[PDB]
Structure formats: C-alpha cells, structure tokens
Amino acid sequence: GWRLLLTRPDEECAALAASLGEAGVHSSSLPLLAIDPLEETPEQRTLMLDLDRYCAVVVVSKPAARLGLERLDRYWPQPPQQTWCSVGAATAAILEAYGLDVTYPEQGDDSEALLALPAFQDSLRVHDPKVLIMRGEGGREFLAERLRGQGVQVDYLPLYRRRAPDYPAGELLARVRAERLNGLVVSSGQGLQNLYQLAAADWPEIGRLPLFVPSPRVAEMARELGAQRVIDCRGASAPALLAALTSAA
Ligand SMILES: [Cl-]
Ligand SMILES: [Cl-]
C-alpha cells in the first residue's frame, strides 16, 4: 500500500498521521517547518484593540487560528461583530470550537476559493471596507493584492515565523529509504520549497516519488522544481488525501 512522508508542521502532522492510520495508510512524519510564535509588538496589539474596524478577518492556517484565538481571547471578552473567514474546513473548525461562525468554501484548496465565495464577497459590502489577515510573518500576497484591487484596505497580523527544524544530517533520505516510503505529502509552497532545499543533491531520487500537493498553484511550483510525479489533491484535508491516494497508482 501507500507509505507516506508527511512534511506539515508538527501539530497538524500528528492529526493527519492518526487519520491516515485509521484509514490503514502508513506514514512517517518529518515536519519541514516549525511554528515559532511571535512576540506581539505595540503596533500589532493596536490592530487587535481596533479589531472591530475590520468587516472580515481571514485566518490562513491552523496555527494562525490557534495563535489568533489567543489574542482574540486576550483582548476581547466579547468578540466584535464581524465575519470570520477561513480557506478550509479544518481551519474553520478550530474557530468554530471557540464558538465563532466561520465563512469558508466547501471545495477550499486555496485563497482563490475563498475570494470567489459569494458569502465572502458579501461581507465586504460595507463603506470603506477593511480586512485583517491573520497569518505567518511571510506568505502569499494574492489575497491582499486582490482585495486592494476591489478597493478593500488590507492589514496583516503576523502571528508566528516559520523555520526549518534542525535535523541530523541525511534525515530526509534516511527516512525515505528506511521506511520504504513511496509517496510524499506537502501542504504548502513553503513546505514544498523546504523539501527541495533539504533534498539537496538527492532531489533527483526524492523528486521521483508521487508528490501529493494541495492545489494547482503548488502543483505548478512542483513541476518548476523538477518533480516528475505531481498529484493534485482537491485540498489539504485528510479525506482529500485519501481520495487522491485511491486514484493514484
Ligand atoms: Cl504534509
Ligand atoms: Cl513566516
């Protein structure tokens, strides 16, 4: 059967490993990014104290929901009236567990899916619309750029930095060989980049394996890097990965 390398951050990695194990798929976890919470600056705290200026808040990732909820809880006994948005169901559920109503697409692989969602566009129907994006220190500029194009002002709240964990030399190749892995999962472009960087000289070998990517954009990024077997899952969730595994080899 399928024997997969997972490369997602540690917390999301364990939840995926468990789902895959429950479905009877073997996996080995090698997080290619670690999540380092950011120290809130005075300018960032001000954004949070003025959270009620935003008609929508977009949470781009599971760590952004977790860390973003900490600051919400810190500064808001009662959350202001605004629309909370997510790209996927899995990010939405962290917010939902807190008690928020979340706007998100059902297909939901990428920023585009949220951007095109009628419920999301409706939340922008406001005088001088302002949106807050909760995310890492860096990321995709697409959503901000597009929102600004429609006359929406866009602020970022960085919550964490993403860094490559330090592994003993050869960890990636050792894992693929020792665990007889026949597939790789990445869940983002940065994750895919870190994989290429860590593969280094063994990339011709590693790039050979079925590479399961969450979206068309990441699929394109992977071809550009020389990955020979690029597989587009319809999103980053476990069910999406299972359906993609069934269809592949
Ligand atoms: Cl992954
Ligand atoms: Cl970052």
Author numbering: 3 to 251
Pull verbatim passages from the article behind this deposition.
Pseudomonas aeruginosa is a Gram-negative pathogen responsible for a significant level of hospital-acquired infections, particularly in burns victims and immunocompromised and cystic fibrosis patients. In an effort to accelerate early steps in drug discovery, the EU-funded AEROPATH project aims to identify novel targets in the opportunistic pathogen Pseudomonas aeruginosa by applying a multidisciplinary approach encompassing target validation, structural characterization, assay development and hit identification from small-molecule libraries. The crystal structures of eight of these targets, ranging from hypothetical unknown proteins to metabolic enzymes from different functional classes (PA1645, PA1648, PA2169, PA3770, PA4098, PA4485, PA4992 and PA5259), are reported here. The structural information is expected to provide a firm basis for the improvement of hit compounds identified from fragment-based and high-throughput screening campaigns.
Uroporphyrinogen III (U3) is the first cyclic tetrapyrrole compound in the haem-biosynthesis pathway and is located at a metabolic branching point. From U3, biosynthetic routes lead to haem, sirohaem or cobalamin (vitamin B12). The structure of P. aeruginosa uroporphyrinogen III synthase (HemD, PA5259) was solved to 2.4 Å resolution using Se-SAD phasing.
